[PDB]
Ligand binder design. Structure first.
Ligand code: CLA
Ligand code: CLA
Ligand code: CLA
Ligand code: CLA
Ligand code: CLA
Ligand code: CLA
Ligand SMILES: C=Cc1c(C)c2cc3nc(c4c5[nH]c(cc6nc(cc1[nH]2)C(C)=C6CC)c(C)c5C(=O)[C@@H]4C(=O)OC)[C@@H](CCC(=O)OC/C=C(\C)CCC[C@@H](C)CCC[C@H](C)CCCC(C)C)[C@@H]3C
Ligand SMILES: CC1=C(/C=C/C(C)=C/C=C/C(C)=C/C=C/C=C(C)/C=C/C=C(C)/C=C/C2=C(C)CCCC2(C)C)C(C)(C)CCC1
Ligand SMILES: CC1=C(/C=C/C(C)=C/C=C/C(C)=C/C=C/C=C(C)/C=C/C=C(C)/C=C/C2=C(C)CCCC2(C)C)C(C)(C)CCC1
Ligand SMILES: CC1=C(/C=C/C(C)=C/C=C/C(C)=C/C=C/C=C(C)/C=C/C=C(C)/C=C/C2=C(C)CCCC2(C)C)C(C)(C)CCC1
Ligand SMILES: CC1=C(/C=C/C(C)=C/C=C/C(C)=C/C=C/C=C(C)/C=C/C=C(C)/C=C/C2=C(C)CCCC2(C)C)C(C)(C)CCC1
Ligand SMILES: [Cl-]
Ligand SMILES: [Fe+3]
Ligand SMILES: [Mn+2]
Lengths: 26, 28, 37, 60, 77, 335, 28, 432, 38, 341
């Protein structure tokens, strides 16, 4: 149940990282 | 029997969505 | 309440805050007088 | 007091006449030398009136 | 004639500069002497009720509506 | 072979695919997938939801004996307030579902997704070399989305006052909102209504005028694209009747005789209307209400003469006394 | 007292300071 | 100029002032005149209708409360002991108006048209980056010094109105700023969700003045930095250095801080004391419950251990954290803190013994007074909801400030979008 | 086209004149209503 | 030529305002309809038909004036000035609500004259008259609400009055006594009208941003104002945009512009069908199954059951003064209240 808390932090930072390392590659 | 009808007709609408996007006429 | 020697001007102060609005109006009659650039 | 009243009225009539004198003098280029001159004198009067009327407020 | 030079003609001035105030002042006098309260049957600003009773008027018939409301008007209701 | 980072970065930023996927899309897809999937499961089978904090839940699910016109996703309980309330903020799942967490999950995911949708519209227009500001038109529904799901709850201080996600839920929200803030007499909703009736009117008119004018259009078409000359025939005569009546006033109101402004006016009217009414609900969250006319007319004996607005204020009392169960002595309230 | 004369003259001061630029040639 | 040659109308006439330097600054200072004019004049007007024997929010003032909060003309308990300082700030703002306006008129009719041909120090142009980073660097230094005027006023010159001193507030001198970054910058690391609200949870003047030390010091630092720097390559590559893009960036920032000002004035009761501005929204509901609790046990007996008719307690219930809180709708607030509520709080939340016998007359009158002054209002300007009869004209300043700044922030958002789109068109033009 | 002759009685003349005299009369009445003492 | 032919060609001159055969029905009727509203919302009372005030002469502002309906005892009467109720007295005629009918009937024939005007104008220029057909959605609404609905009620007193607050009242009235939001035909009206506003915004924006002549100066020299536009944008850039954003787009300009016409019109027509159904007080008020399930288990609670309680409230607290001819007196112990459940 806090493994799920941990998991949600991990999997969403992963997506915003795709978005902004693509927006700087342009 | 009523709840079944609701979800069935909805299931049909999303299948309609799928076909109208990926299997539409060629523009001729 | 206002000072007791300043009470003659008691009605005067009451149209002061409105003055900026009237500038917008002034700035229009100036354009009316010039016949509209 | 009495002098406070007459000077406080003096400030009002002075500020009134200066406020219509300034833009008219500036708009027009004719005889602007003597115009700048009496703007200087009137602004000087005005910034004198303000602190004298200020201090005589305290002898009310 | 067009409405692009219609209030620039000497005709506009000579007539309207007198007829406008006349009928405007007529419209003022209509209310100012209280004639409107008698033409459309508006009740005066303190004749909404009689002093006889404090009920509101409502006409409960259609072919005797006329004399019913005349009866209400009689007592200042 | 082309270094998988560029294969990924090419495949995403491609304008050759069936549906565009953007850099905003990379955020739009999981948030919308969460919101949609949680909504289907919740509209069917969400357990009853205590929404007032009195331990009396409100049903909202088809399997619990509702049809779809009486179903809704029921907002979170009155104990939550503005608190963030994810799964791991509950110590078990059944108290999470009892407290109406699913609603909060849905509405946050949807709001994120909507902004990303606006963003992706700007991005494809930039990519195809188009003009921008189709998204500026799209900010009107986003603004009302914001007002009714985020701003109005923050002003009232709880996510239990938000609009339920349902048919009868939406109408219940409307009724209890009119009761306390009297919005018909608020001008910003009036500019909104004007925009919507006007939008429908101008939609109808534009359709009818163009669809009689066009005779036939044609373009040559090949085996995967469109042709070289987009050809059309339209009629180009008219009578002084319509020119003197309708034409003189659209050209005077555009303050331009170009008919370029026609479609411009077409875009602007509903959007602006809906902006102002979106302002209405926002400012009403801070307890600034519409007009009330009470005892406008009294006679000179001190007795009130009723107006057509007093009938409305009576219905406001009617709805409002039923919408407090809290005490008999509710003196001065909200907030 | 004269505290309507002030509020009168300050509101009619508007067009006056336009009108004087018309004669002395600041702008027509 | 004075006939069309730019492609502008008379209703877009302000667009001719971009390549005019003198006229542009002249517009700015002439407008600044009107701004300080409303300041001085609205305060005089508002004092001529201010009775210093009645609470301020009952009569609806919006400027004199700010002045009262700064230790000028107030006493301990939010009562106004003199009104002369208010008069002073009114007249002085009004006289500075004349000199700002005179400079504006001069620089718009007589002052030069281009400043770049007398000195290029008073000159500027929009592509010459070095001048504008220097002008920006100048302004940051003096705004930082301006920010430090508040902590000067706090520390030496009579101090501010601390509302959390005992006795229901007191004006005192402040002697201790918080110089610990872990306390200060922790606010920017707080959630923007209930229970906090991110900067909007400051509950002591000490954090406020320590923060103003930090603001002043980084603003002076950054000003000194921009005088002694020309922008670097990544900086230049990212942004437009066109004329109207700067106006765009400015609009865009104002929008956000308008939303931030709205949250601030509607929730915070520390830096806007609630005894010059009206009571806060959460404060009114909490007062309504607590004043009834105290009131009913004096007649009947304690029923904050008693159960009610709903299934839950008559006046007290449990939050999901095991803290004893007020019950009713007003269970939606329990993160509230007010000066008149803290001495009745114990460790387990509200402690019932303290309601029984720790009450002071001043707390009770404050709560009982605030219940009937809940923030509500109407555009036809009577208090209450749209059901009550006219006997009250009250509508709280908090609502007015918030709703004004909310609508202006929205309008400024679209203004940002307009000017940003136009800066982009101009850039996309000239890149070829 | 539509060249000007058009004496006193025309269509546009009666159009402005059946919207002119009651509007100005009504502003004359709506004005006197403001200075009623009720 | 005969006099008829001379009359006919006098009526169809090119001139600023078009008179026409249709003009003869439109213009007097329109003038008298409109002007009756004005003269009545400025002077005519309703102290005798409802017990209200509703005109400027009495005190009221722009939102709270109205020309109000007759009393309930008048039946479905025409309310002729020469009828056997007024008997040739302009005062009683004003007092009995007689001019509500005047306005209503003259405005109805003004509507008829306008649609005929659209036909013969369109006949003159020789185009298809779709806009005359579109305009029968407003006629449907008008006649189903302002004429047919109270003709199913017992009197014209339950008709809506011409005024802002009076029709705000109509909204709350229908909400309380018919629960009109829960009627599928009004839902279909809402879908239609909102969809019209949707198409309007989307089309304007799409067209304004696919303009030709974004670079070199206009290679378009006409309009030709009666064409509206459609020449000034590229169908292919917009169609290509919306195929990727939304996944479906129009590829035929004529069918797009027909959809925009179909949507609001079918919308108005359906809501008309529903309200002519309310005229015999046949109401989709309640789901029978939900009522049974709530009777047998009284811990069941729905957003719908709340709406019913609220509407009970609207009726009970609004009735005595909205129907002051019934003489409702409710002791306060019989009215409904939240704290009493
Ligand atoms: C008489 C007719 C009438 C009319 C024409 C209107 C018109 C309006 N009212 Mg209403 N209203 C009326 C009577 C009326 N009202 C009465 C009598 C009451 C009193 C009970 C009210 C009470 C009322 C309230 C309380 C509110 C309104 C609001 C609104 C408006 C807001 C703008 C809008 O449409 O947002 C529509 C709003 C949206 C949020 C829609 C956009 C949704 C998004 C972005 C969805 C996109 C994703 C989608 C679901 C996925 C599609 C997928 C699919 C294609 C596959 C609109 C102006 C609302 C308003 O101002 O809102 C801000 C509001 O709060 N009204
Ligand atoms: C407020 C006015 C102001 C303005 C207009 C500028 C303008 C600029 N500065 Mg600057 N600066 C300022 C104040 C200002 N400064 C202050 C007060 C300091 C002192 C600390 C600095 C120190 C500084 C340095 C040292 C340098 C600049 C640089 C720059 C420029 C180049 C771009 C750059 O570095 O991007 C940087 C990136 C950004 C601006 C984007 C990121 C911004 C942040 C911090 C976002 C954080 C958001 C946060 C997470 C949100 C939380 C929300 C919450 C609710 C959850 C730009 C010309 C450089 C330059 O060339 O100057 C000539 C350079 O060398 N700045
Ligand atoms: C307060 C807001 C404001 C301000 C500060 C300005 C400022 C400016 N506008 Mg302006 N403008 C505004 C609102 C404002 N505008 C509005 C609302 C409109 C729409 C009608 C315009 C329309 C507009 C146009 C059409 C033009 C400008 C131009 C200009 C400027 C150029 C200099 C010039 O040619 O002066 C010319 C000025 C004069 C010939 C005479 C000015 C008369 C003055 C200032 C008298 C004021 C007296 C005061 C009431 C009493 C004394 C007070 C004193 C003692 C303190 C000036 C800097 C002009 C421009 O671009 O010029 C290149 C131009 O032609 N603007
Ligand atoms: C606060 C900062 C600020 C500043 C300094 C500027 C500066 C500028 N803007 Mg603005 N603008 C702003 C905010 C700002 N803007 C906001 C917040 C909005 C959105 C609502 C706009 C919307 C806007 C438009 C749409 C345009 C400009 C343009 C311009 C520039 C050129 C000429 C022009 O239109 O003159 C300014 C115009 C006037 C002074 C004329 C005013 C006339 C009327 C009648 C409008 C307002 C009436 C209002 C409803 C009355 C009630 C107000 C109520 C709140 C009490 C100019 C110098 C123009 C531009 O970029 O040209 C390329 C252009 O077309 N501006
Ligand atoms: C933008 C910020 C702002 C805010 C928050 C306020 C807020 C306030 N002003 Mg104000 N004011 C401002 C700007 C502002 N003003 C400016 C720029 C001016 C110069 C024009 C003034 C001029 C001014 C005057 C002349 C007066 C106030 C007064 C007051 C208030 C005092 C309490 C009171 O009597 O309440 C009740 C408030 C009122 C009776 C004022 C009018 C209220 C409204 C909302 C009427 C709107 C009518 C409108 C035509 C139709 C609906 C809205 C429309 C936008 C659609 C209220 C708190 C009044 C006062 O007594 O101060 C001591 C008063 O008479 N102010
Ligand atoms: C807030 C911004 C501001 C700014 C940046 C300026 C800037 C300017 N003003 Mg000023 N001015 C303003 C507000 C402002 N003013 C206000 C509020 C008023 C009303 C009092 C005036 C009154 C005013 C007057 C009376 C005069 C100016 C003049 C000037 C300059 C004209 C160029 C020249 O020939 O200088 C040549 C002359 C000088 C540089 C000497 C100036 C002495 C002054 C007034 C200020 C002293 C400032 C400071 C303490 C010392 C700076 C030192 C320097 C090395 C940087 C300069 C561009 C002067 C000018 O010649 O205009 C054509 C002039 O005589 N302005
Ligand atoms: C309340 C909403 C609403 C209003 C106010 C309205 C108004 C109008 N629609 C018209 C047209 C149209 N409306 C159309 C579709 C629609 N109209 C809709 C909704 C509305 N349409 C909707 C939703 C649609 C979409 C289907 C079309 C397609 C047309 C047109 O082509 C036509 C037009 O010309 O548009 C420019 C105009 C006809 C002018 C004319 O010559 O009338 C003649 C009418 C006369 C002489 C009598 C009218 C009735 C009277 C006297 C009684 C009503 C009450 C009075 C006005 C008193 C005031 C009442 C208070 C409540 C304010 C007019 C501006
Ligand atoms: C110093 C002083 C003072 C002064 C003041 C002043 C400075 C004043 C001025 C004022 C002004 C500054 C004024 C002006 C005014 C203006 C006007 C009043 C105008 C109006 C407008 C008009 C009327 C017009 C309008 C229009 C037109 C024409 C057209 C259409 C549109 C419109 C509607 C806009 C005082 C007194 C305070 C005292 C203390 C000291
Ligand atoms: C540029 C321009 C413009 C504008 C201008 C301006 C805006 C200016 C300024 C103005 C202003 C800004 C004005 C005002 C000023 C101020 C004043 C005028 C004041 C004075 C005061 C006094 C003198 C005081 C007195 C006193 C004292 C000291 C104490 C006791 C009390 C008393 C009150 C007595 C326009 C748009 C038109 C046009 C275009 C251009
Ligand atoms: C701590 C404290 C304090 C201080 C405060 C402060 C100083 C604050 C600040 C605040 C802030 C400072 C915030 C932030 C803002 C900003 C933002 C939030 C934004 C940025 C930007 C961005 C992020 C970008 C975006 C974008 C992109 C990404 C792409 C393109 C487009 C654009 C550009 C739009 C005091 C004293 C009170 C006391 C207590 C504590
Ligand atoms: C019923 C009847 C009849 C007929 C009558 C008539 C037809 C009447 C008319 C009437 C009329 C026809 C009237 C009119 C009125 C008007 C009015 C009511 C007006 C209002 C006003 C306005 C529209 C304006 C306003 C304004 C504006 C817009 C802007 C600013 C300024 C002002 C505010 C001024 C007869 C003989 C058969 C007999 C039986 C009964
Ligand atoms: Cl409810
Ligand atoms: Fe179109
Ligand atoms: Mn609530």
């Amino acid at each position: 149940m806090e493994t799920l808390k941990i998991t949600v932090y991990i999997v969403v930072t992963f997506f915003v990282l795709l978005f902004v390392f693509g927006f700087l590659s342009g | 029997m009523e709840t079944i009808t609701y979800v069935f007709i909805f299931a049909c609408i999303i299948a309609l969505f799928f076909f109208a996007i990926f299997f539409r006429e060629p523009p001729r | 309440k206002l000072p007791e020697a300043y009470a003659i001007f008691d009605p005067l102060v009451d149209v002061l805050p409105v003055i900026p609005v009237l500038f917008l109006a002034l700035a229009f009659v100036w354009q009316a007088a010039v016949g509209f650039r | 007091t009495i002098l406070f009243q007459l000077a406080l009225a003096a400030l009002v009539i002075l500020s009134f006449v200066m406020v219509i004198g300034v833009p008219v003098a500036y708009a027009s280029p004719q005889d602007w030398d003597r115009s700048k001159q009496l703007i200087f004198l009137g602004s000087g009067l005005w910034i004198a009136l303000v602190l004298v009327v200020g201090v005589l407020n305290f002898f009310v | 004639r067009p409405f692009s030079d219609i209030i620039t003609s000497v005709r506009y001035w000579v007539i309207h500069s007198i007829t406008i105030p006349a009928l405007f002042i007529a419209g003022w006098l209509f209310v100012s002497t209280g004639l409107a309260y008698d033409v459309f049957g508006t009740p005066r600003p303190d004749s909404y009720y009689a002093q006889e009773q404090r009920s509101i008027p409502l006409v409960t018939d259609r072919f005797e509506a006329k004399q019913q409301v005349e009866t209400f008007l009689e007592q200042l209701k | 072979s082309a270094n998988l980072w560029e294969r990924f970065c090419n495949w995403v930023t491609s304008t050759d695919n069936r549906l565009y996927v953007g850099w905003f899309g990379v955020i739009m897809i999981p948030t919308l997938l969460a919101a949609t999937i949680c909504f289907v499961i919740a509209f069917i089978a969400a357990p009853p939801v205590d929404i007032d904090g009195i331990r009396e839940p409100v049903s909202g699910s088809l399997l619990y004996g509702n049809n779809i016109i009486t179903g809704a996703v029921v907002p979170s309980s009155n104990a939550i307030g503005l608190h963030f309330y994810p799964i791991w903020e509950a110590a078990s799942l059944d108290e999470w579902l009892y407290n109406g967490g699913p609603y909060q999950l849905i509405i946050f995911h949807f709001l994120l997704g909507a902004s990303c949708y606006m963003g992706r519209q700007w991005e494809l227009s930039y990519r195809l070399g188009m003009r921008p500001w189709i998204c500026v038109a799209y900010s009107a529904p986003l603004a009302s989305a914001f007002a009714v799901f985020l701003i109005y709850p923050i002003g009232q201080g709880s996510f239990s006052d938000g609009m339920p996600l349902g048919i009868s839920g939406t109408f219940n929200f409307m009724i209890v909102f009119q009761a306390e803030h009297n919005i018909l007499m608020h001008p910003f909703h009036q500019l909104g209504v004007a925009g919507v009736f006007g939008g429908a009117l101008f939609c109808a008119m534009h359709g009818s005028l163009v669809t009689s004018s066009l005779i036939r259009e044609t373009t040559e078409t090949e085996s995967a694209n469109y042709g070289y000359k987009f050809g059309q025939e339209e009629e180009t005569y008219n009578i002084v009747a319509a020119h003197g009546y309708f034409g003189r006033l659209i050209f005077q109101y555009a303050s331009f005789n170009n008919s370029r402004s026609l479609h411009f006016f077409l875009a602007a009217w509903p959007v602006v209307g809906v902006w102002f009414t979106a302002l209405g609900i926002s400012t009403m969250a801070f307890n600034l209400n519409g007009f009330n006319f009470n005892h406008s007319v009294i006679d000179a004996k001190g007795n009130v003469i009723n107006t057509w607005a007093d009938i409305i204020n009576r219905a406001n009392l009617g709805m409002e006394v039923m919408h407090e169960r809290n005490a008999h002595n509710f003196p001065l309230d909200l907030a | 007292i004269a505290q309507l004369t002030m509020i009168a003259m300050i509101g009619i001061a508007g067009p006056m300071i336009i009108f004087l630029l018309a004669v002395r040639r600041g702008n027509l | 100029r004075d006939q069309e040659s730019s492609g502008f109308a008379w209703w877009a006439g302000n667009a001719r002032l971009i390549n005019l330097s003198g006229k542009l600054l002249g517009a700015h200072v002439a407008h600044a005149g009107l701004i300080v004019f409303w300041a001085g004049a609205m305060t005089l007007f508002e004092l001529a209708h201010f009775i210093p024997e009645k609470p301020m929010y009952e009569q609806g003032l919006i400027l004199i409360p700010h002045i009262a909060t700064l230790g000028w003309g107030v006493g301990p308990g939010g009562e106004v002991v003199d009104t002369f300082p208010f008069f002073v700030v009114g007249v002085v703002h009004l006289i500075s108006s004349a000199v700002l306006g005179f400079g504006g008129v001069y620089h718009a009719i007589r002052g030069p048209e281009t400043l770049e041909e007398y000195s290029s120090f008073f000159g500027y142009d929009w592509k010459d980056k070095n001048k504008m980073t220097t002008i920006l660097g100048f302004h940051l230094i003096v705004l930082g010094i301006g920010a430090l005027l508040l902590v000067a006023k706090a520390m030496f010159f009579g101090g501010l109105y601390d509302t959390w001193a005992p006795g229901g507030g007191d004006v005192r001198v402040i002697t201790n700023p918080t110089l610990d970054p872990r306390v200060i910058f922790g606010y920017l690391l707080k959630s923007p969700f209930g229970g906090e609200g991110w900067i909007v949870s400051v509950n002591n003047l000490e954090d406020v003045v320590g923060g103003h030390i930090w603001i002043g010091l980084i603003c002076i630092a950054g000003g000194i930095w921009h005088i002694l720097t020309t922008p670097f390559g990544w900086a230049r590559r990212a942004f437009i250095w066109s004329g109207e893009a700067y106006l765009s960036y400015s609009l865009g920032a104002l929008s956000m801080m308008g939303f931030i000002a709205t949250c601030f004035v509607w929730f915070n009761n520390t830096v806007y004391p609630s005894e010059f501005y009206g009571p806060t929204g959460p404060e009114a509901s909490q007062a309504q419950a607590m004043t009834f609790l105290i009131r009913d046990q004096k007649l009947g007996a304690n029923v904050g251990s008693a159960q009610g008719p709903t299934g839950l307690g008559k006046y007290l219930m449990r939050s999901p954290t095991g803290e004893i809180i007020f019950g009713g709708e007003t269970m939606r607030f329990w993160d509230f803190r007010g000066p008149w509520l803290e001495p009745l709080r114990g460790p387990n939340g509200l402690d019932l013994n303290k309601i029984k016998n720790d009450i002071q007359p001043w707390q009770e009158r404050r709560a009982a007074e605030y219940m009937t002054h809940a923030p509500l209002g109407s555009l036809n300007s009577v208090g209450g909801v749209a059901t009550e009869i006219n006997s009250v004209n009250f509508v709280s300043p908090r609502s007015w400030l918030a709703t004004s700044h909310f609508v202006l922030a929205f309008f400024f958002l679209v203004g940002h979008l307009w000017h940003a789109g136009r800066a982009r068109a101009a850039a996309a033009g000239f890149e070829k | 086209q539509e060249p000007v002759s058009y004496p006193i009685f025309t269509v546009r003349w009666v159009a402005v004149h059946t919207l002119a005299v009651p509007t100005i009369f009504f502003l004359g009445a709506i004005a006197a209503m403001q200075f009623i003492q009720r | 030529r005969g006099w008829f032919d001379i009359l006919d060609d006098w009526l169809k001159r090119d001139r600023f305002v078009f008179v026409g055969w249709s003009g003869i029905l439109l213009f007097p009727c329109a003038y008298l309809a409109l002007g009756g509203w004005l003269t009545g919302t400025t002077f005519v009372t309703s102290w005798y038909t409802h017990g209200l005030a509703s005109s400027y002469l009495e005190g009221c502002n722009f939102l709270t004036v109205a020309v109000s309906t007759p009393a309930n005892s008048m039946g479905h009467s025409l309310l002729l000035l020469w009828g056997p109720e007024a008997q040739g007295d302009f005062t009683r005629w004003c007092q009995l609500g007689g001019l509500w009918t005047f306005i209503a009937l003259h405005g109805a024939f003004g509507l008829i004259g306008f649609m005929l005007r659209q036909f013969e104008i369109a006949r003159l220029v020789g185009v298809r008259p779709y806009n005359a057909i579109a305009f029968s959605a407003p006629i449907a609404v008008f006649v189903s609400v302002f004429l047919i609905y109270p003709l199913g009620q017992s009197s014209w007193f339950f008709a809506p009055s011409f005024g802002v607050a009076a029709i705000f009242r109509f909204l709350l009235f229908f909400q309380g006594f018919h629960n009109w939001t829960l009627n599928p035909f009004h839902m279909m009206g809402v879908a239609g009208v909102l969809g019209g506003a949707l198409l309007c915004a989307i089309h304007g924006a799409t067209v304004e941003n696919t303009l030709f002549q974004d670079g070199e100066g206009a290679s378009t020299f006409r309009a030709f104002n009666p064409t509206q536009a459609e020449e000034t944008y590229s169908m292919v850039t917009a169609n290509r945009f919306w195929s990727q954003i939304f996944g479906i787009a129009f590829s035929n300009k004529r069918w797009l512009h027909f959809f925009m016409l179909f949507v609001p019109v079918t919308g108005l027509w359906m809501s008309a069908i529903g309200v002519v159904g309310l005229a015999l007080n046949l109401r989709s008020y309640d789901f029978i199954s939900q009522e049974i399930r709530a009777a047998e288990d009284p811990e069941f609670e729905t957003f719908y059951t709340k709406n019913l309680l609220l509407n009970e409230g609207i009726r009970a607290w609004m009735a005595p003064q909205d129907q002051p001819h019934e003489n409702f007196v409710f002791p306060e112990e019989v009215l409904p209240r939240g704290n009493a459940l």
